[PDB]
Amino acid sequence: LTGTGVLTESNKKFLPFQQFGRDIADTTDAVRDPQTLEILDITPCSFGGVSVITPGTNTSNQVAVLYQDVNCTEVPVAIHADQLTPTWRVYSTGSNVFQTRAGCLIGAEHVNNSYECDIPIGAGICASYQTSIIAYTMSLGAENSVAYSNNSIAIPTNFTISVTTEILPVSMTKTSVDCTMYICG
Amino acid sequence: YTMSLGAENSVAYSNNSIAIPTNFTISVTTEILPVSMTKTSVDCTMYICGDSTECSNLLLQYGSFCTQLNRALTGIAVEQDKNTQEVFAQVKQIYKTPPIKDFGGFNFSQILPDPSKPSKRSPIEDLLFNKVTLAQKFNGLTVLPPLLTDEMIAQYTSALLAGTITSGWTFGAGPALQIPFPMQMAYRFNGIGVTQNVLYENQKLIANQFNSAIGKIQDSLSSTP
Amino acid sequence: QIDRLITGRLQSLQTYVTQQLIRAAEIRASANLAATKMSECVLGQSKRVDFCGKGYHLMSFPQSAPHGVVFLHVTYVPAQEKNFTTAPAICHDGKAHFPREGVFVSNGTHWFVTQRNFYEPQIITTDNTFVSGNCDVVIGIVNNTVYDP
Amino acid sequence: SALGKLQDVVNQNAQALNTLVKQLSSNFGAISSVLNDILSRLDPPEAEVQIDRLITGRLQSLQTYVTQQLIRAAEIRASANLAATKMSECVLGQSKRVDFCGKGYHLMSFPQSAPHGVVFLHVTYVPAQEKNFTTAPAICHDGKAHFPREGVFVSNGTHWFVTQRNFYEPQIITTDNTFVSGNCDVVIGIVNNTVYDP
Ligand SMILES: *[C@@H]1O[C@H](CO)[C@@H](O[C@@H]2O[C@H](CO)[C@@H](O[C@@H]3O[C@H](CO)[C@@H](O)[C@H](O)[C@@H]3O)[C@H](O)[C@H]2NC(C)=O)[C@H](O)[C@H]1NC(C)=O
Ligand SMILES: *[C@@H]1O[C@H](CO)[C@@H](O[C@@H]2O[C@H](CO)[C@@H](O)[C@H](O)[C@H]2NC(C)=O)[C@H](O)[C@H]1NC(C)=O
Ligand SMILES: *[C@@H]1O[C@H](CO)[C@@H](O[C@@H]2O[C@H](CO)[C@@H](O)[C@H](O)[C@H]2NC(C)=O)[C@H](O)[C@H]1NC(C)=O
Ligand SMILES: *[C@@H]1O[C@H](CO)[C@@H](O[C@@H]2O[C@H](CO)[C@@H](O)[C@H](O)[C@H]2NC(C)=O)[C@H](O)[C@H]1NC(C)=O
Ligand SMILES: *[C@@H]1O[C@H](CO)[C@@H](O[C@@H]2O[C@H](CO)[C@@H](O)[C@H](O)[C@H]2NC(C)=O)[C@H](O)[C@H]1NC(C)=O
Ligand SMILES: *[C@@H]1O[C@H](CO)[C@@H](O[C@@H]2O[C@H](CO)[C@@H](O)[C@H](O)[C@H]2NC(C)=O)[C@H](O)[C@H]1NC(C)=O
Ligand SMILES: *[C@@H]1O[C@H](CO)[C@@H](O[C@@H]2O[C@H](CO)[C@@H](O)[C@H](O)[C@H]2NC(C)=O)[C@H](O)[C@H]1NC(C)=O
Ligand SMILES: *[C@@H]1O[C@H](CO)[C@@H](O[C@@H]2O[C@H](CO)[C@@H](O)[C@H](O)[C@H]2NC(C)=O)[C@H](O)[C@H]1NC(C)=O
Ligand SMILES: *[C@@H]1O[C@H](CO)[C@@H](O)[C@H](O)[C@H]1NC(C)=O
Ligand SMILES: *[C@@H]1O[C@H](CO)[C@@H](O)[C@H](O)[C@H]1NC(C)=O
Ligand SMILES: *[C@@H]1O[C@H](CO)[C@@H](O)[C@H](O)[C@H]1NC(C)=O
Ligand SMILES: *[C@@H]1O[C@H](CO)[C@@H](O)[C@H](O)[C@H]1NC(C)=O
Ligand SMILES: *[C@@H]1O[C@H](CO)[C@@H](O)[C@H](O)[C@H]1NC(C)=O
Ligand SMILES: *[C@@H]1O[C@H](CO)[C@@H](O)[C@H](O)[C@H]1NC(C)=O
Ligand SMILES: *[C@@H]1O[C@H](CO)[C@@H](O)[C@H](O)[C@H]1NC(C)=O
Which residues line ligand 3 at a C-beta cut-off of 6 Å? B 23, 205, 208
Asked if residue A34 has its Cβ within 6 Å of ligand 2, the reply is: no
User: Residues with Cβ < 8 Å from D79, sequence gap 6 or more?
Assistant: A168, A169, A170
- Measured in angstroms, the CA of D42 and the nearest CA of chain C are apart by 22
The count of CB pairs under 8 A between chains A and B is 92
* φ, ψ of residue C99 in degrees (nearest 5): -80, 140
Strand segments (E) across A55-169: 64-68, 97-100, 103-106, 109-110, 119-122, 125-129, 133-137, 143-145, 152-169
In one-letter notation, the amino acid at residue C90 is I
Which residues line ligand 6 at a C-beta cut-off of 6 Å? C 91, 143
Closest CB from C42, C45, C77 relative to B27: C77
Closest residue of chain A to D127, computed from CA coordinates = A159
Residue closest to C88 by CA, chosen among C135, C148, C149: C135
Closest CB from B31, B62, B128 relative to C73: B31
- Whether D and C touch, i.e. at least 3 CB pairs below 8 A, reads as yes
CB-CB contact of D126 with B174 (8 Å): yes
Residue nearest to atom 26 of ligand 4 (CA): B107
Q: Describe the crossing of helices C2-37 and B53-60 by its angle, rounded to 10 degrees.
A: 70
CB-CB contact of A166 with D2 (8 Å): no
- Measured in angstroms, the CA of A43 and the nearest CA of chain B are apart by 8
B105 CB near a chain D CB, below 8 Å? no
Closest CB from B94, B98, B135 relative to A140: B94
Rounded Cα distance, A140 and B173, in Å: 19
Rounded Cα distance, A135 and A121, in Å: 9
CB-CB contact of C85 with C95 (8 Å): no
Ligand nearest to the CA of C108: 5
CB-CB contact of D127 with B175 (8 Å): yes
The half-sphere exposure of D103 on its side-chain side, counting CA atoms within 13 A, is: 12
Residue nearest to atom 25 of ligand 4 (CA): B107
Three-state DSSP class for B76?
helix
Residue closest to D24 by CA, chosen among D16, D14, D33, D15: D33
D126 CB near a chain B CB, below 8 Å? yes
CB contact under 8 A, C39 and D100: yes
Residue closest to C51 by CA, chosen among C71, C65, C28: C71
Contacts of D67 in chain C (CB under 8 A): 18
Mutate to test the pocket of ligand 12, among B9, B17, B20 (most ligand atoms within 8 A of CB): B17
Rounded Cα distance, B73 and B52, in Å: 24
Contacts of A184 in chain D (CB under 8 A): 35
Residue B103 DSSP code: B
Give the pairing of strands B94-96 and A143-145.
Answer: parallel
Cα–ligand 6 centroid distance for C143 (angstroms): 9
Helix, strand, coil in percent for chain B, rounding step 5:
45, 15, 40
Q: H/E element holding D61?
A: helix D44-86
Helix, strand, coil in percent for chain D, rounding step 5:
40, 25, 35
C-alpha distances out from residue B154 to B15, B91, B122, D141, Å? 55, 13, 9, 48
CB-CB contact of B39 with C96 (8 Å): no
Contacts of A159 in chain D (CB under 8 A): 125-128, 167
Dihedral angle sign, alpha carbons of residues C107, C109, C111, C112: negative
The structure's method of determination equals cryo-EM
* φ, ψ of residue C113 in degrees (nearest 5): -115, 135
- Structure's resolution in angstroms: 2.7
Q: Within 10 A of B140 (CB to CB), how many other CB atoms are there?
A: 18
CB-CB contact of D90 with D118 (8 Å): no
Rounded Cα distance, C72 and B123, in Å: 14
Q: With a CB-CB cutoff of 8 Å, which residues 61-80 of chain C face chain B?
A: 61-80
Closest CB from B73, B195, B213 relative to C17: B73
Ligand nearest to the CA of D191: 8
Give the pairing of strands A109-110 and A133-137.
Answer: parallel
Question: Under an 8 Å CB criterion, which residues of A touch D?
Answer: 147, 150-173, 175, 177, 179, 182-185
B106 CB near a chain C CB, below 8 Å? no
CB contact under 8 A, A140 and B159: yes
B23 CB near a chain C CB, below 8 Å? yes
CB-CB contact of D91 with D102 (8 Å): no
CB-CB contact of B26 with B192 (8 Å): no
Residue nearest to atom 27 of ligand 4 (CA): B107
